[PDB]
């Protein structure tokens, strides 16, 4: 009942059936607690990820406007850009990507392989910038010049993280609650927290469907201080768009992303090696490896509410493995 | 259903209309998304591993042993499954093209092998794969492990049962939504081809199955597919009378080397549909499908189903060149 205003928003279908929610018996054995995983890395468009959920809503909205071009921004190895470009090609929309190099690498695989490779396959128009210092303004500058060519453009923010985009993860929460019914009583849910729409959609959904479940966002780019107001605004705007309130507090851990966004760290790469070796599951150096390292330290240091089951949201990211090898 | 099987896939994989590609080609083209199986970037081999690794467990094996190219998709999938189950994986690898290109050597599927803690054994050539795996199975057993051997591509009669299963999905998914005329799959180690051959003969007898070869001539390949076809049919107490159809014009200059038509097929599907093929298998098979339209080489000009057998992580190994 509580989330029924969701059907008011037009949406496309890119996924179809609920993504798998699987027990991780070997990781659970090693960690000493029940770990489950939500497999949003297996969404069926061009190597999947958390963004296909958001794009179902955003692109549906783009088409309502009669738009024929999608314009977004991110890192050279951004998964969002890649899923956006894939969806654009699929629909015969044009796509324009404002890309940056957030880490100052000159490594050829970072510059040319992985997610950046696939963008050329989708015929993405690539616009390089020194830095995404003001992505929203920079995207509007780009859309103006693109509009001048006669294109009918639609601006998708970094990570598709607007209140409309985040509706995909309100919907994920409905899936998750449905799959967990009578099978597992969850205590905690862990997801990486970057552009913030995934965290925020899940925050709203879980508050209304699974009140007593603790949602933990592991930051990938920012301190709790910088990040919390970003999640809160989406949460609040999302709630209002669904005619609900949201009084849940937002929870964030920021101890797992140093030296900074897009830079691999030891605990992240050890989490990647753990999931691969024990579960045959592929994480990534930027997002999920670092999120999972937070889950692990969280168990180690007893940072969760209790000792009960934890759901890790696999938000994708694997193609970046190939861009980060051998280094930088 | 008389064979023990492990659950690696679950729900039937999508079967989709490809409207933009259909528009461009002037033919109705559908796709079977076996690239979207949920284990370590998927592929056609997981269908086979459901039967093969179930068999391994029945024998109380603690180690999976298989063979392939450095960038073999099958090796990668076997290792992922091995990891997931707490089995050791030993892989026998060759460099089938003599490249020194770093991405082919260490990126793509070969990078994942290290993540899955795969024990890597290098060999000069897989000249007799069945024999060399058996020599390796002896060595590893001598160290105190209990190995189970999986052939190249897991293409035994038992493994190919995965693709008789796939046919069931296809048959259910295609009716009533279309009036299919032709099916196209890449034909390599022959497990995927022969399994679909048995299944489609019985389930959709009016459809033409075409295997585009990726490593051999029609003369070298046809007995391979026919033999598996007969072996599979026997173990299911069925008779398989149907012809095997093979086109071999689409893989020069050899296995694991990309060609222009294949890369143009990779580009075409990515740009028109947001679908990713690969330089070794599906790209070359799709090029075969496209040329069949220009040369009017299909039995009739009706709907075609392409079987996406996976392969995409190879893109990252093959870039920027080999
Ligand atoms: C695999 C993966 N996991 C988690 C996240 C974090 O999600 P949010 O951006 O919704 O907070 C991303 C985001 N990535 C960004 C991108 O540009 O790709 C949006 C920043 C992701 O790609
Ligand atoms: C993506 C992809 N597509 C098609 C095929 C051909 O299937 P068959 O081997 O069943 O004929 C492979 C094979 N795999 C090879 C490997 O070593 O990876 C020869 C097995 C494949 O990986």
Q: What is the DSSP string of B222-259?
A: HHHHHHHHHHHHHHTT----PPP-EE-SSSTT-TT---
Pairing relation of β-strands A153-155 and B88-94?
unpaired
Q: Which ligand is nearest to the CA of B186?
A: 2
Technique that determined the structure: X-ray
Q: How far apart are the first and last CA of chain B?
A: 43
Looking at the fold, whether A223 and A319 belong to one and the same domain comes out as yes
Looking at the fold, whether B10 and B59 belong to one and the same domain comes out as no
Looking at the fold, whether B132 and B268 belong to one and the same domain comes out as no
SS3 content of chain A, % helix, strand, coil (to 5): 45, 15, 40
Strand partners, B65: B90, B149
Domain range spanning residue A130?
50-158
Residue A116 DSSP label: H
Q: Which of B73, B11, B33, B110 is nearest to B269 (CA)?
A: B33
Distance CA B189, CA B60 (A): 27
Distance CA B283, CA B250 (A): 10
Distance CA A72, CA A197 (A): 15
Residue B279 DSSP label: T
Distance CA B126, CA B93 (A): 8
Domain end, chosen from B91, B124, B152, is at B152
Query: What's the sign of the alpha-carbon dihedral A254, A258, A261, A265?
Result: negative
Cα atoms in the 13 Å half-sphere on the side-chain side of B311:
27
Q: Which of B145, B129, B148 is nearest to B53 (CA)?
A: B148
CB contact under 8 A, B83 and A278: yes
Sorted by sequence, the CB contacts under 8 Å of residue B318 that are 6+ apart come out as B71, B103, B104, B108, B258, B279, B280
Q: Which two tokens stand for residue A105?
A: 């690498």
Reading phi first (left if > 0) and then psi (alpha if -120 to 50, else beta), residue B170 is in alpha
Distance CA A55, CA A61 (A): 9
Sorted by sequence, the CB contacts under 8 Å of residue A29 that are 6+ apart come out as none
Chain centroid offset of residue A190 CA: 12
Q: Are B168 and B198 in contact (CB under 8 A)?
A: no
- Locate tokens 């500058």: which residue? A141
Looking at the fold, whether B304 and B235 belong to one and the same domain comes out as yes
Q: What angle do CA A78, B280, B304 make, to 5 degrees?
A: 95
Domain end, chosen from B134, B152, B170, is at B152
Looking at the fold, whether B240 and B309 belong to one and the same domain comes out as yes
- Locate tokens 């091995």: which residue? B82
Report the 10 Å Cβ neighbour count for B306. 26
Residues of A in contact with B117 (CB under 8 A): 276-277
Looking at the fold, whether A145 and A101 belong to one and the same domain comes out as yes
Q: What is the dihedral of CA A53, A58, A60, A63, to 10 degrees?
A: -150
Pocket of ligand 2 (CB under 6 A): B 43-44, 68-69, 72-74, 152-153, 155, 186-193, 278, 281-282, 309-311
CATH code of the domain covering residue B114: 3.40.50.1100
Identify the closest residue of chain A to B10 by CA–CA distance: A20
Chain centroid offset of residue A115 CA: 15
Reading phi first (left if > 0) and then psi (alpha if -120 to 50, else beta), residue B39 is in beta
Distance CA A121, CA B129 (A): 35
Sorted by sequence, the CB contacts under 8 Å of residue A212 that are 6+ apart come out as none
Cα-based distances in Å from B140 to B76, B110, B133, B134: 19, 21, 10, 10
Which residue of B38, B116, B313 is in closest CB contact with A277?
A: B116
Looking at the fold, whether A32 and A75 belong to one and the same domain comes out as no
Q: Are A190 and A218 in contact (CB under 8 A)?
A: yes
Chain B nearest-CA distance from A213, in A, is 27
> How does A24-48 read in b/e, with b if 16+ C-beta sit within 10 Å?
bebbbeebebbbbbbbbbbbbbbbb
Q: Point out residues after which chain A has a gap (C–N over 2.5 Å).
A: none
Q: Which two tokens stand for residue A112?
A: 């040319």
Looking at the fold, whether A320 and A218 belong to one and the same domain comes out as yes
Looking at the fold, whether B249 and B309 belong to one and the same domain comes out as yes
State how many domains chain A has. Answer: 2
Q: Is B121 on the interface with A (CB under 8 A)?
A: no
Q: Which two tokens stand for residue B173?
A: 């998914």
Q: What angle do CA A318, A321, A322 make, to 5 degrees?
A: 115
Identify the closest residue of chain B to A48 by CA–CA distance: B36
Pairing relation of β-strands A35-39 and A21-23?
antiparallel
Report the 10 Å Cβ neighbour count for B322. 18
Distance CA B278, CA B265 (A): 9
Q: Are A261 and A218 in contact (CB under 8 A)?
A: no
Looking at the fold, whether B166 and B25 belong to one and the same domain comes out as yes
Distance CA A118, CA B307 (A): 21
Q: What is the dihedral of CA A251, A257, A261, A266, to 10 degrees?
A: -150
Distance CA A188, CA A307 (A): 9
Cα atoms in the 13 Å half-sphere on the side-chain side of B191:
28
Looking at the fold, whether A143 and A188 belong to one and the same domain comes out as no
Q: Are B322 and B106 in contact (CB under 8 A)?
A: no
Q: Which of B152, B157, B255, B249 is nearest to B198 (CA)?
A: B157
Domain end, chosen from A142, A158, A174, is at A158
Is the previous residue joined to B309 through a cis bond, with omega within 30 degrees of 0?
Answer: no
> How does B139-172 read in b/e, with b if 16+ C-beta sit within 10 Å?
ebeeeebebbbbbbbbbbbbbbbbbbbbbebbbe
Looking at the fold, whether B38 and B48 belong to one and the same domain comes out as no
């Amino acid at each position: 009942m509580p989330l029924h205003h969701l059907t008011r928003f037009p949406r496309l279908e890119f996924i179809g059936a609920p993504t798998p929610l699987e027990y991780l018996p070997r990781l659970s054995d090693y960690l000493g607690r029940e770990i489950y995983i939500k497999r949003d890395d297996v969404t069926p468009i061009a190597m999947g990820g958390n963004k296909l959920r958001k794009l179902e809503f955003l692109v549906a909205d783009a088409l309502r406007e009669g738009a024929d071009t999608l314009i977004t921004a991110g890192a050279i190895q951004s998964n969002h850009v890649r899923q956006t470009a894939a969806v654009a090609a699929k629909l015969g929309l044009h796509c324009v990507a404002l890309l940056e190099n957030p880490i100052g690498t000159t490594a050829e695989n970072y510059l040319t392989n992985g997610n950046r490779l696939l963008l050329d396959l989708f015929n993405t128009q690539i616009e390089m910038c020194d830095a995404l210092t003001d992505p929203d303004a920079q995207l509007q500058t780009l859309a103006t010049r693109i509009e001048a060519q006669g294109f009918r453009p639609y601006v998708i923010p970094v990570g598709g993280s607007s209140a409309l985009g985040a509706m995909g993860y309100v919907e994920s929460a409905l899936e998750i609650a449905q799959q967990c019914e009578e099978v597992v009583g969850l205590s905690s849910v862990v997801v990486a927290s970057g552009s913030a729409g995934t965290h925020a959609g899940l925050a709203v959904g879980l508050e209304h469907l699974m009140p007593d479940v603790e949602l933990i966002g592991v930051t990938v780019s920012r301190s709790v201080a910088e990040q919390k107001p970003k999640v809160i605004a989406l949460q609040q705007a999302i709630a209002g768009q669904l005619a609900l309130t949201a009084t849940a507090d937002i929870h964030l851990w920021d101890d797992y992303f140093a030296p900074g966004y897009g830079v691999p760290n030891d605990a992240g790469m050890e989490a990647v090696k753990l999931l691969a070796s024990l579960e045959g599951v592929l994480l990534d150096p930027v997002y999920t490896g670092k999120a999972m390292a937070g889950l692990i330290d969280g168990i180690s240091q007893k940072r969760f509410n209790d000792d009960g089951p934890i759901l890790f949201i696999h938000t994708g990211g694997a193609p970046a493995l190939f861009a980060y090898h051998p280094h930088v």
